[PDB]
Amino acid sequence: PISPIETVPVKLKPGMDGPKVKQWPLTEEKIKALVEICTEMEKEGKISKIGPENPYNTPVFAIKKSTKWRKLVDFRELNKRTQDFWEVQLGIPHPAGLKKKKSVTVLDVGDAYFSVPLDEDFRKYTAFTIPSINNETPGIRYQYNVLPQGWKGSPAIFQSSMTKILEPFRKQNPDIVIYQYMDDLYVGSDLEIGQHRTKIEELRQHLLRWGLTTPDKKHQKEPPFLWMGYELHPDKWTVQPIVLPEKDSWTVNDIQKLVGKLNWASQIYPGIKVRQLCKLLRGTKALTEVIPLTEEAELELAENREILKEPVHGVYYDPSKDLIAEIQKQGQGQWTYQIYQEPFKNLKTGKYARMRGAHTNDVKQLTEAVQKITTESIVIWGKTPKFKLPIQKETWETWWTEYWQATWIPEWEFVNTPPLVKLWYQLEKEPIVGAETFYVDGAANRETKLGKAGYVTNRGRQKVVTLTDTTNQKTELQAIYLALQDSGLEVNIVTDSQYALGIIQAQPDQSESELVNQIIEQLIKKEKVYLAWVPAHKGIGGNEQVDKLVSAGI
Amino acid sequence: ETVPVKLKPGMDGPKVKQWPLTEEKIKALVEICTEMEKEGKISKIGPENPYNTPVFAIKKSTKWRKLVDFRELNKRTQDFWEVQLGIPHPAGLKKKKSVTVLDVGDAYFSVPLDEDFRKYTAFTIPSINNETPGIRYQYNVLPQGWKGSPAIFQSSMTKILEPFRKQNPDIVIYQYMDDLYVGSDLEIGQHRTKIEELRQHLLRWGLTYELHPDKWTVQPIVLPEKDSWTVNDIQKLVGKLNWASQIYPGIKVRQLCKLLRGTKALTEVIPLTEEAELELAENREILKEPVHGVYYDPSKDLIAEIQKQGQGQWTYQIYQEPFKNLKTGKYARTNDVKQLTEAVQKITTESIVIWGKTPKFKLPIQKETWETWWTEYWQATWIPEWEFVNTPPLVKLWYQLE
Numbered sequence A: 001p002i003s004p005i006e007t008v009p010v011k012l013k014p015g016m017d018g019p020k021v022k023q024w025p026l027t028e029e030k031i032k033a034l035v036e037i038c039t040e041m042e043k044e045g046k047i048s049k050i051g052p053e054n055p056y057n058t059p060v061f062a063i064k065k066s067t068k069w070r071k072l073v074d075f076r077e078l079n080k081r082t083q084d085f086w087e088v089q090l091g092i093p094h095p096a097g098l099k100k101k102k103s104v105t106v107l108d109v110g111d112a113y114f115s116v117p118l119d120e121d122f123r124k125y126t127a128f129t130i131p132s133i134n135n136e137t138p139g140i141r142y143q144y145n146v147l148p149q150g151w152k153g154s155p156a157i158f159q160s161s162m163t164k165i166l167e168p169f170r171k172q173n174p175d176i177v178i179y180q181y182m183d184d185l186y187v188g189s190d191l192e193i194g195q196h197r198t199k200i201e202e203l204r205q206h207l208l209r210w211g212l213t214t215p216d217k218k219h220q221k222e223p224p225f226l227w228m229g230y231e232l233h234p235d236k237w238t239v240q241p242i243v244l245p246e247k248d249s250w251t252v253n254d255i256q257k258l259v260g261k262l263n264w265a266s267q268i269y270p271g272i273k274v275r276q277l278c279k280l281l282r283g284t285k286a287l288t289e290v291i292p293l294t295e296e297a298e299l300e301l302a303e304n305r306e307i308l309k310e311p312v313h314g315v316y317y318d319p320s321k322d323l324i325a326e327i328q329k330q331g332q333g334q335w336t337y338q339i340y341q342e343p344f345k346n347l348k349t350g351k352y353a354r355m356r357g358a359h360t361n362d363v364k365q366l367t368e369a370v371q372k373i374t375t376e377s378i379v380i381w382g383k384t385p386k387f388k389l390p391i392q393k394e395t396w397e398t399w400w401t402e403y404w405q406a407t408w409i410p411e412w413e414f415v416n417t418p419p420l421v422k423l424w425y426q427l428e429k430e431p432i433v434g435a436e437t438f439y440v441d442g443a444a445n446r447e448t449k450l451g452k453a454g455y456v457t458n459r460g461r462q463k464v465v466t467l468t469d470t471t472n473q474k475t476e477l478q479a480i481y482l483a484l485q486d487s488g489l490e491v492n493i494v495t496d497s498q499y500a501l502g503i504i505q506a507q508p509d510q511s512e513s514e515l516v517n518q519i520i521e522q523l524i525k526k527e528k529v530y531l532a533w534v535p536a537h538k539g540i541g542g543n544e545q546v547d548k549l550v551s552a553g554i
Numbered sequence B: 001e002t003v004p005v006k007l008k009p010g011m012d013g014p015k016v017k018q019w020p021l022t023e024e025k026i027k028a029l030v031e032i033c034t035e036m037e038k039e040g041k042i043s044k045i046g047p048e049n050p051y052n053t054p055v056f057a058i059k060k061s062t063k064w065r066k067l068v069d070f071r072e073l074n075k076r077t078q079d080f081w082e083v084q085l086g087i088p089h090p091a092g093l094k095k096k097k098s099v100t101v102l103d104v105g106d107a108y109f110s111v112p113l114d115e116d117f118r119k120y121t122a123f124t125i126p127s128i129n130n131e132t133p134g135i136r137y138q139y140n141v142l143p144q145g146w147k148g149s150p151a152i153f154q155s156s157m158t159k160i161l162e163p164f165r166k167q168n169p170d171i172v173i174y175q176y177m178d179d180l181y182v183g184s185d186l187e188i189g190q191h192r193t194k195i196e197e198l199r200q201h202l203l204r205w206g207l208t209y210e211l212h213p214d215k216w217t218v219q220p221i222v223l224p225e226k227d228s229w230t231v232n233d234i235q236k237l238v239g240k241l242n243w244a245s246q247i248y249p250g251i252k253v254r255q256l257c258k259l260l261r262g263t264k265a266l267t268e269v270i271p272l273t274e275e276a277e278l279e280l281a282e283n284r285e286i287l288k289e290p291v292h293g294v295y296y297d298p299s300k301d302l303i304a305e306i307q308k309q310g311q312g313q314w315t316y317q318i319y320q321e322p323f324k325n326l327k328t329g330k331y332a333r334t335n336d337v338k339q340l341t342e343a344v345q346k347i348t349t350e351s352i353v354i355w356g357k358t359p360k361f362k363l364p365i366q367k368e369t370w371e372t373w374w375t376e377y378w379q380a381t382w383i384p385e386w387e388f389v390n391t392p393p394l395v396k397l398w399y400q401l402e
């Protein structure tokens, strides 16, 4: 059928005419296939024959499936010239946000696009031509009366048509839940098996009234349904079956695929780990290069294969209950979480493993994970979960009220799931009496890649080192690193590098730079460290001295 | 009849994605938009309109209120509302003892919108978890939050306010977006009587918060007043003053720096020399006044930076080029995001009163966190442009309070 729904008005782009691409000459068998296909389409009203006056054309082709031919229309020129449409690809539901149902039925619409009418005033622009044999005579000309396959507007127009058609039915059956995806409909209810079937029948009849055919009960697929990499029953969901290969040799291609599969499973299998596997891809080039698994990657894989050994499903959402989100630290930079309404029946799980910058601490990371989960929760359930975090109220509060960036997180409470996040050191707020004062500095040359780092002290001491393969910034961190190694358990340090100050001041506990990591070790060793800053070349006390020192020969 | 509107040269409509919203806000918008549609204010639209502008709900009272984020449409309409139909900003407003802000947005819904422009005002009410397609509308009348609305409506507004202005020649009334700012020098009681009077005038046409600008004072950079001074103290002082000198002509540190001779212990006490003490007094004297030499340029954007100071305190500066500060200030009062939201609204209100423009904000917070929470506390009917930054620890320090 062709739906009697009103058409969507369509236009070409402001300063543009319809396409006029010349039809390529085709072999005889393909001309035959097309004549036969179009003859049928014509009889069903999908296309109409047109005259010579219509100046537009778009190339058509035919391709043997099997022993069946398919009609292909190359709509690039038309698509280039067609207006933009309201985006259809705006997001899909996550299964964990769905509500449990007694029954869910899938109905696919037959010849979906061809069952929806195209704007009358726009049909002319879709003209195509079946070429005569060796192009001796004029070709047979048709234009479309329905949404063509491969045309820009089809997806969006089909979906908006389906929505209008469903509208009265939804108004009449408010407790029936329908989800539209491409040419499928998922129809769920809490009715008993008999009345559910009846309701499906009414939907089909309503759909048919509007030109849309669907499979009858005999031909309807049985659960679980495969969709978007998930597998769905009325009462639980999981990801599609994943089989991890057993192989001696792993190419970059294999490892990339394995990591994607593991990342995908991690939305319902708790504890999935991919860090060690990912390190294998570092600076990785040829997809065919074999990468020897490291012992750690080999164990990680095994630990994963074990987690995947037996099926795990997520449960659906109950809107009358709170969401609970728990987070655990796994390794460094690695976080894991689970979301449930009754312990411990997970709606979904997840992992967070992102470094925002080169330098952070665990308190900042945990807060970032909370934010990520919070955004996700709004999307999926339209509300915020209550968190259980492996951090003490005081630890978190000391940190954020002191730090210069703002934050807020939803309601939460401490849960004793080691490892706990703590502050590994705290810089003093005031300078330290009876602690040696170290003035530090550093230099390097822009075309030398060489430089120096050193310190001068109020107790008369000094030192300068030579650095190879270093920047003006790296020397600044080296100097502070020097001051720390050579000082007692309490030290005051004066830098003129806002750069170095910025870093240390944020109280990092991990870093991409090994220099910084080394400094972090020192800071954790000290009993007290005060760090202060002064402007370079203001002729300040000990700063001038050390500047002098390290700048020699540079 | 409608006024024809055009986008700027070769610019296309906005195509901004709708943000995810909580359940309660979606319900609110649904009911608000159903009623608006019944009343002809908006109509449902099809997929042949590819434009979109985000929409939010705010709690205004316990009555939800639709807020459309027209920031992008505004940017793409600037030739129209600014150069073609600009609304002049009175320099007198900021000098008034009292300024009351009135919401006159309801006015716009009685003026039809140019039919060919309606498509650009498309918006979408989303569903939770993308379970159903969003509900799509566009406007048939002037929309609240679009800078085109007051520009188009202004000749009607002039006619509306004409009797009131004639009868109270010393009262200054200024329109910015959905609001009316009304300033006078009357005792607080008499001012309020005049505002109620104005509302009666407004009410005849379907149009239905107190500031005190002449009590806005520069927020000086503060110099410590010390009993005795350590090398650390003097080192901090010189750093701070050195930065100040990049802003204020005349700032001197020569004398103060003399004290910092030799490689000395941070906690060592060191007596001030009588001339350093003088140098200090003079710098302190300069830091009280506005920066000599900084003037507002009407062809340039305003920028506003904010620093979190701790304990519910916040500092901010407004400039068009860093450290050419046009204005510096503070906000006071814990929920960091709620406070920042409040400070942003306050800073924006002052900029409208002072210059007739909103600043682009530099916000000391992670993007996602702000995006998640700002609408929980937002009450204003405009939204400034913003971006997110990491405050340099020294900037915070140098603008510290006492």
Ligand SMILES: O=C(O)c1nc(Cc2c(-c3ccccc3)[nH]c3ccccc23)nc(O)c1O
Pocket: A441, A442, A476, A496, A497, A498, A535, A536, A537, A547
């Ligand atoms: O450590 C730094 O960041 C560092 N930076 C510089 C860069 C620098 C400053 C400067 C003046 C006051 C405050 C900060 C920088 N003034 C300069 C004048 C000319 C060239 C370079 C500089 N020069 C140094 O000698 C130095 O040690």
Ligand SMILES: Cc1ccnc2c1NC(=O)c1cccnc1N2C1CC1
Pocket: A093, A098, A099, A100, A101, A104, A177, A178, A179, A186, A187, A188, A189, A225, A227, A232, A233, A234, A235, B131
């Ligand atoms: C793929 C999909 C997307 C969105 N919703 C659903 C489905 N499919 C289901 O099988 C499903 C399962 C359980 C509950 N709702 C479901 N439905 C809803 C319609 C009844």
Ligand SMILES: [Cl-]
Pocket: A512, A513, A514, A515, A516
């Ligand atoms: Cl390194």
Ligand SMILES: [Cl-]
Pocket: B210, B211, B212
């Ligand atoms: Cl005030």
Ligand SMILES: [Mn+2]
Pocket: A441, A442, A476, A496, A497, A536
């Ligand atoms: Mn330096």
Ligand SMILES: [Mn+2]
Pocket: A441, A442, A443, A536, A547, A551
């Ligand atoms: Mn130096």
